[PDB]
A paper describes a structure:
Interestingly, most of the reconstructions resolved at a resolution of 2 Å or better correspond to apoferritin from various organisms, as a result of its high symmetry and intrinsic stability. Indeed, apoferritin is now commonly used as a standard sample to assess microscope performance and implement developments in cryo-EM. We show that basic settings for automated cryo-electron microscopy imaging using the Glacios® electron microscope, often thought of as a “screening microscope”, allow structure determination at high resolution.
Standard image processing procedures were performed in Relion 3.0.5 to calculate an electron optical density reconstruction of mouse apoferritin at 2.7 Å. In particular, iterations of particle-based CTF refinement, followed by particle-based polishing and beam-induced motion correction procedures were critical factors in increasing the resolution of the final reconstruction of mouse apoferritin from 3.6 Å to 2.7 Å. We have also re-calculated the final EM map without symmetry, leading to a reconstruction of 3.1 Å, showing that the same validity measures (EOD = 0.8, sphericity = 0.990) are recapitulated for the asymmetric reconstruction. The Coulomb potential map clearly resolves densities for all secondary structure elements of apoferritin (helices A-E and Loop L), with the appearance of main chain carbonyl oxygens consistent with the FSC-calculated resolution. Side chains are generally well resolved, with the unambiguous observation of cisPro161 underlining the quality of the reconstruction. The side chain of Arg63, a residue at a two-fold symmetry interface between two protomers, could be built in two orientations. The 2.7 Å 200 kV cryo-EM potential map also revealed density for 72 solvent molecules, compared to an average of 121 +/- 24 water molecules per monomer of the asymmetric unit in the 2.24 Å X-ray crystallographic structure. Two putative cations could also be located (although their identification cannot be determined from the present cryo-EM map alone): an iron ion on the fourfold symmetry axis and a magnesium ion at the ferroxidase site of the monomer. Nevertheless, the densities for negatively charged amino acid residues are consistently lower in the cryo-EM map, a phenomenon that is likely to be more prominent in 200 keV than in 300 keV reconstructions due to increased inelastic scattering.
Residue numbers in the entry:
A (entry chain A), B (entry chain A), C (entry chain A), D (entry chain A), E (entry chain A), F (entry chain A): 1 to 174
The structure:
Amino acid sequence: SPSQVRQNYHQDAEAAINRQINLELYASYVYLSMSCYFDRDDVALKNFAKYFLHQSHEEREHAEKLMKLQNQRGGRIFLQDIKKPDRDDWESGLNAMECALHLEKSVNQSLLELHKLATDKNDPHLCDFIETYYLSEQVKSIKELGDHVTNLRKMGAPEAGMAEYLFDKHTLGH
Amino acid sequence: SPSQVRQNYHQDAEAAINRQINLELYASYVYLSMSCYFDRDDVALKNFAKYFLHQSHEEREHAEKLMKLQNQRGGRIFLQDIKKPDRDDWESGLNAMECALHLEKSVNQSLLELHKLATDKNDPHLCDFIETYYLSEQVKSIKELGDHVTNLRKMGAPEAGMAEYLFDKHTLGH
Amino acid sequence: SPSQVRQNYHQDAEAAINRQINLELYASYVYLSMSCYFDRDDVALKNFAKYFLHQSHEEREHAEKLMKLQNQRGGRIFLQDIKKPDRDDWESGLNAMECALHLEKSVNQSLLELHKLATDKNDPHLCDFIETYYLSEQVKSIKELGDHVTNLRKMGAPEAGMAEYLFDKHTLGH
Amino acid sequence: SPSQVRQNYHQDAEAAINRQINLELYASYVYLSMSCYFDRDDVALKNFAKYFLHQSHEEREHAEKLMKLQNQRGGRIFLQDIKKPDRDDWESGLNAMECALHLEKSVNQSLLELHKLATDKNDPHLCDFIETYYLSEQVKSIKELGDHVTNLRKMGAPEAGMAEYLFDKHTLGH
Amino acid sequence: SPSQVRQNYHQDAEAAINRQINLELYASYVYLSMSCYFDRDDVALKNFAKYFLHQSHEEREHAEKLMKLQNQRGGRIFLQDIKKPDRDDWESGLNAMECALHLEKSVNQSLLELHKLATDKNDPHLCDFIETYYLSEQVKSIKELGDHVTNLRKMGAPEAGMAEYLFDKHTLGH
Amino acid sequence: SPSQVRQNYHQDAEAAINRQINLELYASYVYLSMSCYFDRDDVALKNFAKYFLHQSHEEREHAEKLMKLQNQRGGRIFLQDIKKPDRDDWESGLNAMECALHLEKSVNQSLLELHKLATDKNDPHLCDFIETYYLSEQVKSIKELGDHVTNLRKMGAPEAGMAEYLFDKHTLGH
Ligand SMILES: [Mg+2]
Ligand SMILES: [Mg+2]
Ligand SMILES: [Mg+2]
Ligand SMILES: [Mg+2]
Ligand SMILES: [Mg+2]
Ligand SMILES: [Mg+2]
C-alpha cells in the first residue's frame, strides 16, 4: 500500500501540505475577484485590474508546484471545496490593496507553521523546498504591497480621486 | 443605481451568466484533479498529465472571457464556492477520458440553455457571443474526446496495459 | 446505437444536410462541364475555362466542410448519385454566365431553407455554421456573377464577338 | 425591374438600412463638430481633438460598409439630408464625453431594432452581418466611453482643471 | 470675448469661410453618392466607383484643412445641414463625369469670390492660404475631368457600351 | 462539322475515352466515401482519412487530364451520371484497403482495353499518352495497396485492434 517512492515523509506533513494547497487556490480566487471589480465600468482602473489578474495567475502556479512536490514524495493529493471570497465589492484601490496585504500575511503565517512542523519531524528536503520557493518570494510580495499601501495613503487616496488615477499610470502601468 | 453602460440586458440573463462562470471554474478544478492523478508515481503517464493540465488552463480562460462580457454589458459578477471534484482517484486513462467527455457534454448542455434564454429575451449580442466563442469549440472538444475514447477502447485499454502507454506516446505526445 | 458525441441534433436536420452535400457535388460537376466547353478548340476562351475550373474546386471544398460538420455532430453521411448536368454545350460566355448565376441562386435558396429548419428545431451551432461559412460567401458569388452578366450584356455579347474576347483578358485574366 | 441579384430581401428591411446609413453619417458629423471644439485656441486639448477626429473617421467607415451591403443584396440607396449637430459649443471634456456616450447608445438602440425586424422577416444573412460587424464593436465603444466618463468625474472634472489636462496626456495620449 | 489669438481677421471673412466648409462637405456627399451608383449590380463599373470614392475622401480633407485654418485665426466654426445630392441615379459614366465637372467648377467659383473678399479686406495670410492649397489643385482637377469627358465622348459613350468598359480598365484602372 | 484540329482520331476511341472519364470520377467519389467513414467519431482513424482524401484528389486530377486530351484531339466530352458507391459503411481499415485494391485493378483493366483499341485503330499519340501518364502510376498504386493489405493482415487486423492504430501512425502517418 505505501508508495514505492516514499521515504522519510510523515503523515502529519502530507496533511499539512494538502491544506496549504487549498489555501493558495483560495488566494487565487480572491485576486480573481478583485480583478473583476476594477474592470467594472464605474470603477474603471485598468492597471489595477491587470495587476491583480497577474497575482491570481502566480498563486495558481504556487499551488501546482506544491501539487508536484506531494507527488514526488509519494503522498496523495486530497482536494477540498474552494470557498467564495469574503466580499464581492471592494470599495477602493486602497482598500483592495490593504486586504491583499492582509491575505498575503496569512498565507505567510501558514507557511511558517508548515516549516516548523517539518523541522520537528526531521524532514530536510521539505524544509529546503518551502524555504527556497515560498518563504522568500512571500516576503518580497509583502514588502511590495506594503509600499503600494504607503504611497496611496500619502497621496490621499481614496478622498483625493486623482491619487489612484495617477498611481494606476505611474506605479502599476510600468 | 443601474450602470451607465447597461442596455437591453435582462436580469434573468445576468443570473444565468453568473452560473455559467461557476460551471467553467469547476470544470477547471476537475481537470486539475485528473492531472494530479496521472502524475502519481504509480500511474506515471506524463503525457496524459500534460494533456489535462492544458485543458485546465483553457477552461480558466473561458471563465475569464465570461467575466469580461458581464462587465462590458454592465452586469455584476457574483462568485460562489467551487465544489470539490466527484472523486479523487480516477482508475485509468480510459476512465478519466470517459468522465472528461461526460463533463464536457454537461458544460455544452448549459450553454445551449443559456442561448435559448437569450433568444427569448431578444438579446442578440449575447447570443452572438456564446455562438462565436463557446458553442463551436465546445463541439470540437467533444468530438476529439469521443475519438480518444474510441481508440483506447479498441486497443483494449485498460486490460491491455500497453494500450495507454502507446496512446500516451503517439496520440498525446504529438 | 446513438453516437457517443451526439447532442441536440435532430434527425430532420441530419437528412437536410445530406441533401445539401449532394447539391454542392452536383454544382461542382456543372462547373466542370462548363470548363470543358470553353477549352474546346472552336470556342477557345482560356480565361473563362480557368474561371469555372476554380469555381468547381471551391464547390467541392464546400461539400467537404459539410462532410466534416456532419461527422463532428455525430450524424451519418449517406451519399447519393450525382446527376449529369442539364446540357453539354453551353452556347456562349454570356449564356454560361447566366446559368451559373441561376444555379448559384438555387444553392442559396436551399441553404436558406436549411437555416429555417435549424432555427425551428433550436440548433444554434448548426445555424451559426451555415451563417459563418455558407450564406455570406454565397452572397458575394451571386453579386460577382451578377456584375459579370451585366458587363457582357452591355458590351454586346454575344453578337459583338470582341466582347467576350476583351472580357476574357481584362476582367477574368486579372 | 427587380434586381437580378435580389433574393429574400424584404422592402421593409431595405428601408430600415437606408435610415441606419443616415444615422451613421450624422454621428460622423457630430464627432467632427466636437473635434473642432477642442482645437479651439481657448480650450486647447489636442488629444481630445485627435480622439474624436478618429471616432469621426470610423463612423464614416461604418456607413460605407452598409452602403456595400445594400448594393450586394440588390437594394437601392436613397440618401437624405444630414442634419446639423444639436449644439456648436460643447462646454467641457466631460460634457463632450457624456454626449458622445448618449449618442453611441442611440446608434446602438437603432441597430437592435434593425436586428429585430430582420429576424421577423427571416433574413439570416442580414442578421449575421449586423451581429458580426456592428453590435459587437458598438458594445466595446460604449464600455470605453463609460470608463472615460467615470475617470474624469472621479478626478473632479470640470471644476479641477488639472483633471482634463492629465487625462489628455495619460489616457488619450497613449 | 474676442479670441486672444485674433489679429486682422474681419467678420465678413469668418462668415465666408464657414460657407466654403459647408460647400466642401456637400461635394464630399455628392461623390459618395456617385460611388454608390457605380457599385450597383446593374451598372457594375468598379473602377469608376473607386475613382469617386477617392474624390470623396479628398474633399472631406479639404473641409478639415479649412476647419484648422478657422481655428488658427481665432474664428469660430458654425456647421449647417448638409443637403442631399441633386439626384440618386446618375445614368452613365459620361453623365456622372459631366456633373462632377460642373460641380468642381462651382467649388472653384466660390473660392475665387472668397479670394476677392480677402484681398479687399487686406488679409494676406488668408489669400496665400487659399492660393497655395485650394486654387491650384482645383485647376488640376478641372483639367483632368475635362480630359476624361473628352475621351469618353470621342469613344462614343454611352451609346457604344464598350467605351466605358475600356475606359474603366485603361484610364481609371491605372 | 468535324473539328478543324481533328486528325487520325477514330469515333470508337472518342467513345472509349468518355467512358474512362466517368470511371475516374466514380473512383474519386468512392475514395471520398471511405474518407468520410474513417473520420466517423466511432472509427476515428485520422491518418486513414487523410490517405483516402488524397487518393480522391488524385483521381479527380486523372479525370481532368483526360478531359484535356479529348479537347486537344478535337473530340467532344459527354458527361454521364456518377453512380453512388457500392456501400456506405466500410467495416475496417483492412476491408477498406482490400476494396480500394479491387477498385484500382478495375481501373487498370479498363485502361488496358483502351490501349488495345488505340493500337488496333493505329493511334500512336493516344497510346503514348495512356502509357506515359496512366499505366505506369496505376501499377505503382496497385503495388503499394498490395503492400498495405499484406502488412495489416500480418499484424492481425482487424481482430488485433492495435494493428490499425499502429499502422495509422507508422506507415500512413509518415
Ligand atoms: Mg505563494
Ligand atoms: Mg468552455
Ligand atoms: Mg457553397
Ligand atoms: Mg457603427
Ligand atoms: Mg477643394
Ligand atoms: Mg488513374
